[PDB]
Amino acid sequence: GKLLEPKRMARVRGWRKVGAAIVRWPGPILVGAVALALVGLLTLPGYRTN
Amino acid sequence: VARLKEEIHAGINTGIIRAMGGSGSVVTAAGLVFAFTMMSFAVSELTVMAQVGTTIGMGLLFDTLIVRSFMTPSIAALLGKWFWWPQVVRQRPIPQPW
Amino acid sequence: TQEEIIAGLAEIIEEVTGIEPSEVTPEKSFVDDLDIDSLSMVEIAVQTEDKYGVKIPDEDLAGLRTVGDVVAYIQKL
């Protein structure tokens, strides 16, 4: 019957928009993501176990 | 990567944006569902299993929302046609008449 | 030759957002009638540049607000 149907689609539109953003200006977005990654990484070397 | 490889023939920019619009939503849905199912272990009394649940949940949240949605497609788009070496690919097809 | 430009742009924007080509006319703007954002505008610009090989630079999309303006820009180049 009718059990697997799409309704109220609003995800692929937003993700195409973020695709447009990520293709046009890759430099700034890449550097921002790397910045967050470095914020994550710097805490690593000080790490103790119990 | 497989989905990206599928639709790279009509340029690389259009290919990246279509691969996003087509599979970013799916990967993000799966990642979020599993990440929060693993975050529900925080309220657990046992500390080891709460720690594991939180570690995995935060890991998947960071992976899905930043590393995989902004960082890898950005590297692909930046490197352009040298993302498929040693295969030879055109960065955009022959222009078509209006 | 403007009509073919309008046809191409109609097909592309129907692909993007889902507006039927018959509705698109050069006597109406983008944001206030079609409800077309700016990121959707870079969507249209990138896709048309990639498919038909016309480069519309950044910091020039905002300078055009109507379909007539877009076709004028394309056919002036």
From Swiss-Prot, chain B:
State the superkingdom.
Answer: Bacteria
Conditions for induction:
Repressed by MmpR5. Repressed by iron. Regulation is IdeR-independent.
Q: Where in the cell is it found?
A: Cell inner membrane
Transmembrane domains' residue ranges: 26-46, 69-89
As for family, the record states: Belongs to the resistance-nodulation-cell division (RND) (TC 2.A.6) family. MmpL subfamily.
Job of this protein: Part of an export system, which is required for biosynthesis and secretion of siderophores. Overexpression of the system confers non-target based resistance to azoles, clofazimine and bedaquiline, via an efflux mechanism.
Assembly and oligomerization: Interacts with MmpS5. Can also interact with MmpS4.
Protein name listed in UniProt: Siderophore exporter MmpL5
What species is given as this protein's source?
Mycobacterium tuberculosis (strain ATCC 25618 / H37Rv)
- What is the organism lineage in this UniProt record? Bacteria, Bacillati, Actinomycetota, Actinomycetes, Mycobacteriales
Instruction: Tell me the name of the encoding gene.
Output: mmpL5
UniProtKB/Swiss-Prot annotation, chain C:
UniProt cross-link Isoglutamyl lysine isopeptide (Lys-Gln) (interchain with Q-Cter in protein Pup), position: K76
Q: Name one GO biological process term.
A: lipid A biosynthetic process
* Residues recorded with modification O-(pantetheine 4'-phosphoryl)serine: S38
Q: Which residues form the Carrier domain?
A: 1-77
Write the signal peptide boundaries: none
How this protein is processed and modified after translation, per its record? 4'-phosphopantetheine is transferred from CoA to a specific serine of apo-AcpM.
GO CC terms, sorted: cytosol; membrane
Indicate the principal place this protein occupies in or around the cell. Answer: cytoplasm
- Sorted alphabetically, which keywords does the UniProt record give? Cytoplasm, Fatty acid biosynthesis, Fatty acid metabolism, Isopeptide bond, Lipid biosynthesis, Lipid metabolism, Phosphopantetheine, Phosphoprotein, Ubl conjugation
Which one of the record's GO molecular function terms can you name? acyl carrier activity
Annotated compartments: Cytoplasm
Q: Where are the annotated coiled coils located?
A: none
- Protein family membership: Belongs to the acyl carrier protein (ACP) family.
Give the protein's biological function: Acyl carrier protein involved in meromycolate extension.
Q: What is this protein called?
A: Meromycolate extension acyl carrier protein
In its UniProt entry, the species of origin is given as Mycolicibacterium smegmatis (strain ATCC 700084 / mc(2)155) (Mycobacterium smegmatis)
Q: Which gene encodes it?
A: acpM
